A = this chain, B = another copy of it.
Amino acid sequence: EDVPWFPRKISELDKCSHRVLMYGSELDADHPGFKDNVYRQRRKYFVDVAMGYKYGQPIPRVEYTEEETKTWGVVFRELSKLYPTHACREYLKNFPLLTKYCGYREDNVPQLEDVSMFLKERSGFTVRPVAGYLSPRDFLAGLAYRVFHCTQYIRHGSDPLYTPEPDTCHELLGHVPLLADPKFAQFSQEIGLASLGASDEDVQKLATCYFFTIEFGLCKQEGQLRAYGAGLLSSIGELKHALSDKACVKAFDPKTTCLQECLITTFQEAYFVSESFEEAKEKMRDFAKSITRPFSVYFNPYTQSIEILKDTRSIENVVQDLRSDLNTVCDALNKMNQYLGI
């Protein structure tokens, strides 16, 4: 009972979403908009929209300004020039889909509500507007429910190519195309599940893993290095450098990787590569065993809650469930022999 609290059902996740340690309206001293009073009005308007968000209510639509829509446009064209050659297969497949259904156009900033309904249909993810920085415990808790917290504001127009903080541009062009991949979604959820009720030290390690994978991971496809890290896909300078010849690149291993330090400003010392998200997801699930907690967690996608496996009765039902599902596999194999003679 000395285990740190975690949300046990989807509606409880609101406590995590609203425990904002640092609000978006709080610009850092070296922020390009630190003395822009027009920009703080927008920043505090977005914080208000996010703070008002509650479970069971559609994600508010926001009317973006012209200098926010071009700043988006600027980031949109420069990165599109490097996606065919720098992005993973999963990105390049889902990105045209976003143009068709989520309004990914240079002249249009996508709405989170659109993106949420799109992700739910493709991989079961849904986005939440967040009013600022969360504890890594609270942020990762969202992942356990396949909920990604998104900033809804646009970076400053002074320098649209580089931002030290997350902005909607980063969320939409960096994270969302990959969250649309079912295999990637499972991988993200595994990190979340692992954090639930974990120690602060373990949460930080998971947060580190999140950083070097979700934000800055590379992946090897057909003998080539492509970026899937969202931070890479939203920073052209880093994106080009990551796949550059003079870069230190190491294989992704949860136990090794998690001990390294994360650099907010300078380019990272090393970038980690995963063969596949299924491959990375299983390395997370074996890392999750080493994490200290009195129980295991099962996620119930039907009730959108967390099952605690602390006895044989709940473990058996899970196993019984797996037995039924294996029966369906047999049915499928039967039908296939039945219809194709194989």
Query: A-side interface residues toward B, CB under 8 Å?
Result: 9, 11, 56, 117, 120-124, 146, 182, 185-186, 278, 281-282, 285-286, 288-289, 293-298, 300-305, 309-316, 318-337, 339-340, 342
Contacts and interface: CB of A to CB of B under 8 A. Distances in A.
B301 A335 contact: no
A286 B301 CA distance: 24
16 contacts: A120-B303, A123-B303, A124-B303, A281-B324, A282-B324, A285-B324, A294-B335, A295-B332, A311-B336, A312-B333, A314-B332, A315-B329, A318-B325, A318-B328, A321-B325, A323-B326
Contact of A319 (B289, B301, B333): B333
B124 A339 contact: no
A316 B9 CA distance: 28
A322 B326 contact: yes
Contacts of A331: 285, 288-289, 296, 309
B124 A302 contact: yes
Given A121-B9, A312-B337, A332 B296 contact: yes
Contacts of A297: 328
A293 B182 CA distance: 26
Nearest to A337: B312
A127 B311 CA distance: 32
A290 to B, nearest CB: 10
A324 B320 CA distance: 11
Contacts of A337: 311-313, 316
B335 A293 contact: yes
A285 B321 CA distance: 12
